[PDB]
Amino acid sequence: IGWRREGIKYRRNELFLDVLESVNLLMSPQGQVLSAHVSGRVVMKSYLSGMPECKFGMNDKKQSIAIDDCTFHQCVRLSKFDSERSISFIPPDGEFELMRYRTTKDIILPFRVIPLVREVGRTKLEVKVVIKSNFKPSLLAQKIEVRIPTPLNTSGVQVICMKGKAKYKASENAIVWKIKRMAGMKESQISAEIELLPTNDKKKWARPPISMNFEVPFAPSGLKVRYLKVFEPKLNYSDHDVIKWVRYIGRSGIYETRC
Amino acid sequence: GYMMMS
């Protein structure tokens, strides 16, 4: 074995699994998903004694998700995944990437963006954006940013938002609304008045999408870890001696809602 | 965050 030395010993045999997912969305102005996909990787950080034979189990096809394709670390026995979908491997010590994967089916979209505009003649836009969190209420999203583009003839912006903070950034022609925490199954809204400069009648504005950034503590693909079994047949620790941890870190990629 | 695994 080339990726693992033979004499490894730990008093505290511990492992950490990171399920790291980027969820991507393009949503139409009428609420139809135009395109959506998840890119994921599973990083393992193991401190295990000797040369353990590990088995990784997830909810691949109550909730069972569909993996469009994936690639593994060279340590994974591919032929075991080819006739039984069993991810078996002797892990390298420390941190390594166990697999990369891509999902498109039955994606959890953590946030819904509902915009609303009201052209007050040629002087101003009166606009309201509502975000809805669509996940278990016991979970918090963090680092939420809602990004609302403004026309290039904007002379000034007023905003009201009961939650978070919002600044107009004329350098970037966007209102940036930042929210530190939001729990699942909640609504928050921002109102903005956008005062306009005179502008060329013919030259119109193709309203760019409202876009979002967020971090959620679940896998938007729906992936759940079911087990990571550790079997070291020569040494006197067994599976239940191993201290095992999982965390899910789902982040936004392209997350754009068309107006 | 990290969760104890079953």
Numbering used by the authors:
A (entry chain A): 159 to 219, 238 to 435
B (entry chain P): 1 to 6
Original paper wording:
Clathrin-mediated endocytosis (CME) is a major regulator of RTKs involving the heterotetrameric AP2 complex composed of large α and β2, medium μ2, and small σ2 subunits. AP2 binds to transmembrane cargo proteins that contain specific motifs such as YxxΦ (Y denotes Tyr; x, any amino acid; and Φ, bulky hydrophobic residue) serving as μ2 binding sites. In this study, we discovered AP2 is also an IRS-1-associated protein. IRS-1 binds with AP2 to prevent IGF-IR recruitment into clathrin-coated structures and thus enhance surface retention of activated IGF-IR.
We also analyzed the crystal structures of μ2 C-terminal subdomain (C-μ2) bound to IRS-1 YxxΦ motifs. Importantly, the side chains of Tyr and Met residues of IRS-1 YxxΦ motifs are inserted into the binding pockets of μ2, which are shared by the AP2 cargo proteins. Collectively, these results indicate that IRS-1 is recognized by the AP2 complex via the μ2 subunit in the very similar manner to conventional endocytic cargos. Using IRS-1 truncated mutants, we mapped the central region (amino acid residues 543–865) which is necessary for the binding to AP2. This region is almost identical to that for the clathrin adaptor AP1 complex found in our previous study, which binds to YxxΦ motifs of IRS-1 including Tyr 608, Tyr 628, and Tyr 658 via its μ1 subunit. Indeed, the Ala mutation of all these Tyr residues in IRS-1, but not a single substitution, completely abolished the binding to μ2 in vitro (IRS-1 3YA mutant). The Tyr residues of the YxxΦ motifs of IRS-1 (Tyr608, 628, and 658) critical for the binding to AP2 are part of phosphorylation sites among multiple Tyr residues in the C-terminus of IRS-1 that mediate the interaction of IRS-1 with PI3K and subsequent activation of PI3K. In addition, AP2 would preferentially bind non-phosphorylated IRS-1 since AP2 cannot recognize phosphorylated YxxΦ sequence due to its limited capacity. Our results indicate that IRS-1 inhibits the recruitment of IGF-IR to CCPs through YxxΦ motifs in IRS-1.
